[PDB]
């Protein structure tokens, strides 16, 4: 799955300051981690639709957070995008 | 890794040569699959509740291991290959849920 080790590695990579766990950046990072885990899981297991729902919703939430960061401070949006390689 | 329990039931007719053979065969398989053995319980001769392979008894082995998860299934395959090995069941270890405590 996704152990707390990998998790904290990601949170700590994207934290806007130490002790930050709820940044929009940290959020879209974590989201995109599970997104890629799920998509790789769905390259095989194509016939598993009930998880595929999970993925649709995840991309939804990711795009809402990104659409927020775009509106508020676009510079950090471009930094995040360029760091994760999205869009 | 995770920590599992390997139950193995084999034919209760083996002399010392064959039993030592099947057992060190299980050792070798576990080595090849990367299983660190934390403890072992050799129960041995036990009357089965029903005939298995027409044999009314079974020789019981219980292992507690820690090993890579993605290698569990393959491991079980490798175990069931032996003729003398009759039951293979690997279970993920669990906390001993008490009742009537």
């Amino acid at each position: 799955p996704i152990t707390k080790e990998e998790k904290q590695k990601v949170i700590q990579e994207f934290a806007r300051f130490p002790g930050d766990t709820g940044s929009t950046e940290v959020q879209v990072a974590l989201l995109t981690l599970r997104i890629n885990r799920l998509s790789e899981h769905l390259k095989v297991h194509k016939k598993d639709h009930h998880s595929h729902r999970g993925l649709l919703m995840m991309v939804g939430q990711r795009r809402r957070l990104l659409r927020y960061l775009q509106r508020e401070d676009p510079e950090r949006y471009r930094a995040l995008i360029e760091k994760l390689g999205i869009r | 890794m995770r920590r599992y329990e390997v139950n193995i039931v084999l034919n209760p007719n083996l002399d010392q040569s064959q039993l030592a053979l099947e057992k060190e065969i299980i050792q070798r398989a576990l080595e090849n699959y990367g299983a660190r053995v934390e403890k072992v319980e050799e129960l041995g001769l036990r009357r089965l509740a029903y005939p298995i392979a027409k044999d009314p008894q079974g020789y019981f082995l219980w292992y507690q291991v820690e090993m890579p998860e993605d290698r569990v299934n393959d491991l079980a395959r490798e175990l069931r290959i032996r003729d003398n090995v009759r039951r293979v069941m690997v279970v993920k270890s669990q906390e001993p849920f008490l009742a009537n405590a």
Partner: protein, 70 residues
């Protein structure tokens, strides 16, 4: 009639290898006794079912028996 949990000690509901205790939860036949007769909780029965089935695959507890009566 007394219930099984009532007349029993502190036992591990998850241990599939303990036949001496599990055999207390089967009927005359190999069936699993309802919670009305076992005195277990919803969760407790849910766990017992699985551990009994695991033990049945090991040849430790039977799948079914024969009724000696009638």
């Amino acid at each position: 009639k007394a219930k099984v949990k009532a007349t029993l000690g502190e036992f591990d509901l998850r241990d599939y290898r303990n036949v001496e205790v599990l055999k207390r939860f089967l009927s005359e036949t190999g069936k699993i006794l309802p919670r009305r007769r076992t005195g277990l909780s919803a969760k407790e029965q849910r766990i017992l079912a699985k551990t009994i089935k695991r033990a049945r695959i090991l040849g430790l507890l039977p799948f079914t028996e024969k009724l000696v009566r009638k």
